[PDB]
Design a protein around this ligand. Sequence first.
Ligand SMILES: Oc1ccc(/C=C/c2cc(O)cc(O)c2)cc1
Ligand SMILES: Oc1ccc(/C=C/c2cc(O)cc(O)c2)cc1
Ligand SMILES: [Ca+2]
Ligand SMILES: [Ca+2]
Ligand SMILES: [Ca+2]
Ligand SMILES: [Ca+2]
Ligand SMILES: [Mn+2]
Ligand SMILES: [Mn+2]
Ligand SMILES: [Mn+2]
Ligand SMILES: [Mn+2]
Lengths: 231, 231, 231, 231
Amino acid sequence: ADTIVAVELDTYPNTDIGDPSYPHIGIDIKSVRSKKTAKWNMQNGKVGTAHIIYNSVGKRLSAVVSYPNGDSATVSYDVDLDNVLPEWVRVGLSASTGLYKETNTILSWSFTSKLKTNALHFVFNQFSKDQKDLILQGDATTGTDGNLELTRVSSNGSPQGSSVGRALFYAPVHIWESSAVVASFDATFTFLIKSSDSHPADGIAFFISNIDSSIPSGSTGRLLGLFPDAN
Amino acid sequence: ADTIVAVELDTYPNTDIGDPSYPHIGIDIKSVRSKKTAKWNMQNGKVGTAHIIYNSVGKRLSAVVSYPNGDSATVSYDVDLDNVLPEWVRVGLSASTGLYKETNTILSWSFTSKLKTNALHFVFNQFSKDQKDLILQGDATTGTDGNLELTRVSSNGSPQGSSVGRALFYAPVHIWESSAVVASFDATFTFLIKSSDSHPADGIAFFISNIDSSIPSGSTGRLLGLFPDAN
Amino acid sequence: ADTIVAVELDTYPNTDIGDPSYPHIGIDIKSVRSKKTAKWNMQNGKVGTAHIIYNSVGKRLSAVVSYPNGDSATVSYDVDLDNVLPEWVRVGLSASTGLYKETNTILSWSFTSKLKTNALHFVFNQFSKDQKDLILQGDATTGTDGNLELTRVSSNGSPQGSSVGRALFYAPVHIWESSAVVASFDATFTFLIKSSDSHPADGIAFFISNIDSSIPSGSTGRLLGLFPDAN
Amino acid sequence: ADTIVAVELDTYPNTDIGDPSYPHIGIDIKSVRSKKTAKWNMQNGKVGTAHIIYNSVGKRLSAVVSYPNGDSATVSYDVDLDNVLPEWVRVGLSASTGLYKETNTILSWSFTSKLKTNALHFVFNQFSKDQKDLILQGDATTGTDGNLELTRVSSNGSPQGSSVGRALFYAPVHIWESSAVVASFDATFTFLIKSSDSHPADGIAFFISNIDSSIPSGSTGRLLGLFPDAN
Ligand SMILES: Oc1ccc(/C=C/c2cc(O)cc(O)c2)cc1
Ligand SMILES: Oc1ccc(/C=C/c2cc(O)cc(O)c2)cc1
Ligand SMILES: [Ca+2]
Ligand SMILES: [Ca+2]
Ligand SMILES: [Ca+2]
Ligand SMILES: [Ca+2]
Ligand SMILES: [Mn+2]
Ligand SMILES: [Mn+2]
Ligand SMILES: [Mn+2]
Ligand SMILES: [Mn+2]
């Protein structure tokens, strides 16, 4: 099984696998049942922002999700990523729909990792049809609206259930190094989740996995394309 | 009085005004009584590096100091700096000698604040005999060996006593903004602290203060360049 | 007199002091007589973007202006700026109205100089009603719509006549250093130039000047905010 | 055949394939016979710096190679990389020895490419045994001196002839895009060429090639691992 560290933007409470009884942002350490979560009012059809921040000094993995009006959810978790993640990882995005669904749209994604100095930095404020520095997975596609649609969409712009999609930066990232004095990464991505369903599902995750990581089978819905299961 | 947030590389144990009984790094908020410190073994005549990181999500200020051989010292303090720093600040470096002295040689200094974007970034890997972006104060001087001497050094390479100096970056810095999702800043500087005294003193600080902050009188020893008293 | 290097977005053809007979971008060195210009079709009421790039290897200053639909104008001029700019400069934005007027709204501005490293970088995607890193001059004001109005605008959104204004970044900038392998800088700003006049005037400039440079009197029209005369 | 844009740091005049009768830096466009060259005193066992700079506005591909003492060679060439290179490329380093030889050592390599914004940026100030974000080719190796040895070395630190080596960033780079207003890249790398031979050979190249590019067969010596032949 993949090793996973995720921030999750979780639109659909699955309270029978850990979720709080609300949409939430959550920090995920090797598990779908978030180490730490926070109430998050996912704003339908509004374009939202995720910042994820971590460094090996403070050893707090942080995440905000805000929307243009200011409503803002913060989750922090105190964890030493050096002990969870392998030295080398791929960094990526993941979204999933279940029995409920939504567009899981990414309008930009940037990522910096730094070892103090080696550094990788990418920003995608657009995406292309053939996004050669992204590895797309499952239902995920780019172009030509310069967006990345993590889960399936349907001719007329309609979110498809049971979809799971994932983009990963193509370069593995050197995410810690034992001699590094500071190992930090941060990620930002803007997303537009629009649903018309009774309830949106299941959300979007930023993630850091072992390099070769791929969707686990049937990890659509509540497993957000990160976990084989909800253990 | 200057509002003052600082990370101190405190070479001299003033065990009667806070200091633990060894050299240490500390996080000072509006008081030289470090809210927190860690044991730092200062390696005389060695070029170390100080990294200071903070963001408004994690709301944790961290600093690590290391030297080429790898002895690290790390301190972290959970604080909302919105609740302490004025919206605009100047950033700087402070150093002080007292009864005992040391070279307080800053070799490089870099700084990044960011509101998420407004950002400021400067890096000085070489200081100039004339540096029109640094506000020099006290006995701090620059050049032309590409270093910033914070406290006085005679013709012969001798640290002076009861010396005090600072270099703030010239532009004021916008360190928070209550509409900002993430206010973050990190700072790095490398220093080449040397003494042949009985015990080095009194160390170097990275500090954030009000835009007009200046050296408080007789702040020259244990007060680094930062506080007017030990309160 | 100010030493002045500037890239002008020149909305008004003053065909009697240099201007080609159309709107144009120009590279001005120490004279409003553009060493070179290109035809620029200013799109009224459109948010464009100006990029200015220079390094001391290629020794070529380039600027392109574009708007969301893709009309680009590009000018390039081969010049050693070592041979023109003083070692320290302040960078800024200048705009001017005359007989005819325009909104001179700067939406964002960013700047990078680098000596290879010393570097400075700032980006303003949102200006503040109170911006302690900008030196405002003439009729330039900021906030709180997150823009920099360089020239005067009445209560009702009306550009004023014979108006002049600049915002220089606060810190002086170290633009060259004769020991530097590469002195490079690039600048970006987006502007939201609008007029309902017979012909807009007189446009916006990115400029580099001596640290103490200030608006030359009656430099308000065709002189943008830069020269005291058309020499 | 690969498409190649190289800057070459050429230690060995092969005047019967274009080279000037001296060591030189040269710009290479789809050809080993440099479009433009410059005298360059390769300093034996001294650690040198290469900056390569290009943007699609100025359309001058530039390069400096300097050494700690200041001796500095500049080559500039006016070329539109959009017409030579495919949209997607891999960026890399290449070195070769022939009948003559040298260490072709890389101590750091950084690279920024920007489309104006998508951006890729990496810096390697060290390298590791298993440098997962580098694709190594031919004789090229990394670790554990945190260096990259583009051509073979021999137990006791001795340069081997007929060696060709190459490192490429793992992510393809999006090097131009037809809607980009500015497409720029720059690269820096520091190299230590030490020879003890009668004459060093053949030098080091930065290069930008079609993504799948690999050493052409028998492109050691004067072809620097970039070209099938010296056409
Ligand atoms: O922040 C940093 C600044 C500089 C460096 C230096 C790397 C380096 C490595 C070498 O083998 C030789 C050398 O001369 C320099 C590393 C990190
Ligand atoms: O420099 C840049 C700054 C901002 C952007 C914006 C990208 C973007 C793309 C979308 O589909 C929707 C959106 O709301 C924003 C692009 C470049
Ligand atoms: Ca869920
Ligand atoms: Ca003390
Ligand atoms: Ca004019
Ligand atoms: Ca040759
Ligand atoms: Mn959840
Ligand atoms: Mn102390
Ligand atoms: Mn003009
Ligand atoms: Mn050659």
